[PDB]
Amino acid sequence: TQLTREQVLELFHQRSSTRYYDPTKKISDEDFECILECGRLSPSSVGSEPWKFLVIQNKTLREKMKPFSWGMINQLDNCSHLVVILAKKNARYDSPFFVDVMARKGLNAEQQQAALTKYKALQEEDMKLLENDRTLFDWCSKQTYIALANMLTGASALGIDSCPIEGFHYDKMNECLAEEGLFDPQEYAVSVAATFGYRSRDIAKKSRKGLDEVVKWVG
Amino acid sequence: TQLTREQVLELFHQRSSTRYYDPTKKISDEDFECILECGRLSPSSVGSEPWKFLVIQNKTLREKMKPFSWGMINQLDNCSHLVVILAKKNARYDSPFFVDVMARKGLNAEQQQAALTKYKALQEEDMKLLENDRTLFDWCSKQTYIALANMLTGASALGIDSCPIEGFHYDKMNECLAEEGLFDPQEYAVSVAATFGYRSRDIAKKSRKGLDEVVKWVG
Ligand SMILES: Cc1cc2nc3c(=O)[nH]c(=O)nc-3n(C[C@H](O)[C@H](O)[C@H](O)COP(=O)(O)O)c2cc1C
Ligand SMILES: Cc1cc2nc3c(=O)[nH]c(=O)nc-3n(C[C@H](O)[C@H](O)[C@H](O)COP(=O)(O)O)c2cc1C
Numbered sequence: 467t468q469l470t471r472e473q474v475l476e477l478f479h480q481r482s483s484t485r486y487y488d489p490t491k492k493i494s495d496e497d498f499e500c501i502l503e504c505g506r507l508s509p510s511s512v513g514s515e516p517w518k519f520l521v522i523q524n525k526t527l528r529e530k531m532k533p534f535s536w537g538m539i540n541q542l543d544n545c546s547h548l549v550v551i552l553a554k555k556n557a558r559y560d561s562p563f564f565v566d567v568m569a570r571k572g573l574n575a576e577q578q579q580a581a582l583t584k585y586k587a588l589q590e591e592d593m594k595l596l597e598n599d600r601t602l603f604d605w606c607s608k609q610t611y612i613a614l615a616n617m618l619t620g621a622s623a624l625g626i627d628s629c630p631i632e633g634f635h636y637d638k639m640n641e642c643l644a645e646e647g648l649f650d651p652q653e654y655a656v657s658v659a660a661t662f663g664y665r666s667r668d669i670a671k672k673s674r675k676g677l678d679e680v681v682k683w684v685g
Numbered sequence: 686t687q688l689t690r691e692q693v694l695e696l697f698h699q700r701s702s703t704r705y706y707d708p709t710k711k712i713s714d715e716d717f718e719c720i721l722e723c724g725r726l727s728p729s730s731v732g733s734e735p736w737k738f739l740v741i742q743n744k745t746l747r748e749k750m751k752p753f754s755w756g757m758i759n760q761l762d763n764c765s766h767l768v769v770i771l772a773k774k775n776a777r778y779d780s781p782f783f784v785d786v787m788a789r790k791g792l793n794a795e796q797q798q799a800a801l802t803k804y805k806a807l808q809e810e811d812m813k814l815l816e817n818d819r820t821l822f823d824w825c826s827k828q829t830y831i832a833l834a835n836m837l838t839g840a841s842a843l844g845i846d847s848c849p850i851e852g853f854h855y856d857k858m859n860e861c862l863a864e865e866g867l868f869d870p871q872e873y874a875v876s877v878a879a880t881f882g883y884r885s886r887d888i889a890k891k892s893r894k895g896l897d898e899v900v901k902w903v904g
């Protein structure tokens with residue numbers, strides 16, 4: 467809630483991508499719903515919250531993922547928890563989805579007419595999102611990477627390890643989770659995944675480009 | 686480094702988007718560098734780190750932004766620090782950019798060949814990123830939203846308020862920054878921005894969809 471600079475830097479050095487989990491250690495129900503709160507509470511362009519979290523604990527569905535999920539093939543066998551983050555498809559400014567967003571903010575017919583104009587200008591001319599489905603979807607998916615990041619960091623502050631995952635066939639992952647009836651494929655699609663658990667190896671050392679290469683100061 | 690579930694929950698609850706900053710209060714050099722380290726230390730797909738952070742402290746450059754940055758037009762004057770995050774354009778697997786990525790990990794001719802095969806599978810087959818230029822830029826831009834999230838969370842842990850920013854004309858933010866020589870527009874493009882400072886009003890109440898509609902457990 468309040469940390470020193472030393473405690474902050476150590477929080478982000480200690481967070482590593484964990485490829486090897488101890489299958490004997492499970493995350494408690496309490497710890498993991500806290501990790502999920504970190505995602506839920508995440509900021510979100512125009513409060514859109516365009517995410518759904520699938521917690522994949524069924525072991526046979528994990529096995530069914532392995533043939534197309536080379537980026538996590540062994541982690542699927544040993545991680546405590548697997549989260550697949552979906553992102554909202556077709557989140558147009560004039561959609562029922564954004565009517566839900568305005569309703570959660572209590573906007574009158576006037577404030578709605580102002581908000582929709584702002585949504586429209588953000589989507590249509592600021593960010594050029596309405597070119598095709600993929601560009602609008604990728605806008606929501608970006609918001610979900612905020613939720614992903616916060617879940618990795620909250621987990622690590624709880625002493626729980628994690629690993630973000632893009633290494634899988636996205637079309638096959640979308641099909642397989644839709645055929646289990648886990649989400650409506652016209653409404654949502656897979657954005658990114660993450661495993662969680664307790665590492666079985668030492669933390670690898672951070673390798674990054676230096677601060678002088680990634681930062682540019684304009685005084 | 687290690688918090689409790691209540692500590693973690695308030696760390697993410699206490700962060701909110703600040704639209705009103707105290708022009709009298711400035712972030713320390715040491716406090717901000719630690720914020721920037723939270724970004725630098727963020728995870729990224731295949732270690733790509735496809736970001737650059739422009740810290741816009743120049744006051745008259747901030748003024749040029751106001752005509753096309755309605756999302757932050759009040760914050761521009763009073764915020765302590767403004768960061769504009771760029772994402773790499775054309776980060777193709779076979780590009781010089783990924784030679785740097787492989788170099789930073791010290792990969793032999795055989796290890797580079799395996800890594801190149803994995804990057805190609807990821808980009809062409811799994812995520813279908815080579816459809817056009819926007820799909821590939823939007824992938825790198827997603828990674829930058831991880832960096833963005835961690836900087837907001839690091840700020841909040843240091844007592845520093847923040848607001849993430851998409852409310853500007855991207856076309857005109859790009860050209861304004863590129864014509865002033867701050868990045869190469871064929872190599873990078875604006876992804877998202879964020880202000881940092883100390884709030885001048887009260888923290889508004891968190892409003893989020895309930896955990897029971899954003900989470901679906903699969904047993
Ligand atoms: C969105 C995203 C997707 C990633 N996908 C995978 C993956 O499928 N499998 C994996 O082992 N690592 C994956 N990584 C981890 C990166 O390779 C890792 O973040 C990077 O090499 C830096 O290492 P560090 O996170 O340990 O600091 C992914 C990272 C991100 C942010
Ligand atoms: C990527 C991103 C871009 C945003 N752009 C803006 C913006 O331009 N101006 C602004 O005032 N708020 C902006 N917001 C803030 C959101 O409106 C805010 O996160 C959301 O309404 C939830 O409120 P909270 O962050 O206070 O919890 C942005 C949020 C995100 C994550």
Ligand SMILES: Cn1cncc1[N+](=O)[O-]
Nearest residue numbers: 537632633730731732807
């Ligand atoms: C992204 N990805 C996919 N497979 C492996 C990775 N990695 O980040 O090393």
